A paper describes a structure:
Corresponding to earlier crystal structure data, for all [name] variants a space group of P1 21 1 was observed with two copies in the asymmetric unit cell (chain A and B). In wild-type enzyme S319CpI acts as H-bond donor to E282CpI and drags its carboxy group further into the PT pathway. In variant S319ACpI, the carboxyl group of E282CpI is slightly shifted outward, probably due to the lack of the hydroxyl group at position 319CpI. In S319ACpI an unprecedented water molecule (Wat735) is located between E282 and A319, and the nearby water molecule Wat873 of wild-type [name] (chain B) is missing here, suggesting a translocation enabled by the unoccupied space of the missing hydroxyl group of position 319 and the slight outward shift of E282. Although the distance to the carboxyl group of E279 amounts to 5.8 Å, the presence of Wat735 may explain the dramatically diminished yet still detectable H2 release activity of variant S319ACpI (6%).
Numbering used by the authors: 2 to 576
The structure:
Amino acid sequence: KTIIINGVQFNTDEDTTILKFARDNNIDISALCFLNNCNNDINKCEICTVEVEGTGLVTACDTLIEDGMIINTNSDAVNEKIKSRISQLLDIHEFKCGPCNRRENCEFLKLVIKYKARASKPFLPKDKTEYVDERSKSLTVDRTKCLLCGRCVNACGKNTETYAMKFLNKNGKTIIGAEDEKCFDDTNCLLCGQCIIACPVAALSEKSHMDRVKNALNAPEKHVIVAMAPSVRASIGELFNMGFGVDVTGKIYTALRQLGFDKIFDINFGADMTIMEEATELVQRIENNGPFPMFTSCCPGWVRQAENYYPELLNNLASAKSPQQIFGTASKTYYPSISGLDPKNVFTVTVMPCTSKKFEADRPQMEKDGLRDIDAVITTRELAKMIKDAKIPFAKLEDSEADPAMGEYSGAGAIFGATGGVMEAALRSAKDFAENAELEDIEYKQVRGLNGIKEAEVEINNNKYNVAVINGASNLFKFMKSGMINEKQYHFIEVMACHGGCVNGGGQPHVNPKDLEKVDIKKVRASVLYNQDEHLSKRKSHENTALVKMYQNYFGKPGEGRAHEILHFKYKKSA
Ligand code: 402
Ligand code: SF4
Ligand code: SF4
Ligand code: SF4
Ligand code: SF4
Ligand code: FES
Ligand SMILES: [Mg+2]
Ligand SMILES: [Mg+2]
């Protein structure tokens, strides 16, 4: 093929789109609705308009290059077409970037500025209440920002295959929303927030818990614990311009203290707890020769998927609470016993890469004696906003350490946030537990990485066992519907609803789709976690000294009695 673009001749054998070819050759073509290798098939945004001599104006994102094509990306006709589309989008867009939560990284604003577009009539609703949906415990919608680009719909389809995000005909107008325009929580939605990650503007957001947190912090009698997820320390730096793949663990501990939190712990402590309980259960099942398979239960997106699509597997889930809720449980029981705090005055806050965690924390039965395991959950993005509002110079902060009692963690706990992390961590303990040994080879590289479905054969006490790692909600559907689960007897299966694991969670920093072209965000965020594991002295959950003391002095033997009654949670199907 010979192609001419803006007077420049190219010779190529490639079969690809105008958009992809131009960008591979440093030619600028704007786009909006094209993402995840899909555009909006009905009602295309046409921001990728280019001119093909002989043909006219075409959409570059879904038009293949052809031999003999003469292309102009920046002619008068092209720019006025694009400007006109943006102008029309402004006509249905509350253009008020001041108090907008996407002010600093909005795709639409950048386009508006680039083409100097203006609305034919500014959209200024007086009563936004009919445009906003805040019913969900996890997600919120503000349709005064929505461009109807379909990016959330395609991402839901591609990441989960549930199609819980749909186009709807509402009062004769097109919107996006859940089936029947119900609250997402009341549908098959996983509350995973991949739709939010896909959104170019502030139409989709997390359900805020920031007011819960600020109120607890300012409440005189409240003692506010905070603990961040594995993934946060590998990610939040992005939002302070520190680059990608930067370990900012110590800076976070420092920032949290400056925010006024009363105790700094870590969810990775909770991860080690979950392994204590879950590895014990795995060994138990092995000894009882069943039931198999056991599934992880730490991902609330997967739990909702099981509840909504495979309720028969609910009994197969590990009874151990997630690191979040198991941590919380201990924060209202164990922690008062070593601090003298009144349990009622403890207010437990987590920082998560996840929107689904908010729903998990607000489950009615996730409490004991009237005390919630977890009182608030803020996303990585929310914590970043609190830090900036407080004018804390994050990139300049000196490192501090966590408070040790529920703050220490092993390398096993640290890798939880990557797909295959829970699996690897769990095997390191299950092998030691079952063989009554302290084995030296602890790295299970076979369950790592971005393959959608991963399997391995493991030898535990000189018997062979089959494990699988399901990487993404759509891959759980594939695993089940394809019958792959029946090709052999699986004994232990990890499921994460977000591809890449929690490092790619719905509460994570948005990433410029151009930076995404340059950076493997799932691998670079994960690399921070495996790096920590590499350099930690303790690399098994049961070698966590603060945790061992907690079990020795308070809970007793894991997976049994006191531990079972308090630290476990079983999901049940309808009769
Ligand atoms: N609870 C919990 Fe987890 C832990 O530890 C997080 O905090 Fe995850 C992360 N990062 C999230 O969100 S949940 C799914 N299991 C893997 S990691
Ligand atoms: S979504 Fe973007 S363009 Fe719209 S008000 Fe917010 S920052 Fe401005
Ligand atoms: S939260 Fe997840 S399952 Fe629900 S609509 Fe968004 S992408 Fe789909
Ligand atoms: S919510 Fe966001 S991603 Fe979905 S159609 Fe509206 S602007 Fe596009
Ligand atoms: S994979 Fe992690 S971030 Fe994604 S829904 Fe599950 S727990 Fe949340
Ligand atoms: S980016 Fe090509 S039609 Fe939207
Ligand atoms: Mg298409
Ligand atoms: Mg206070």
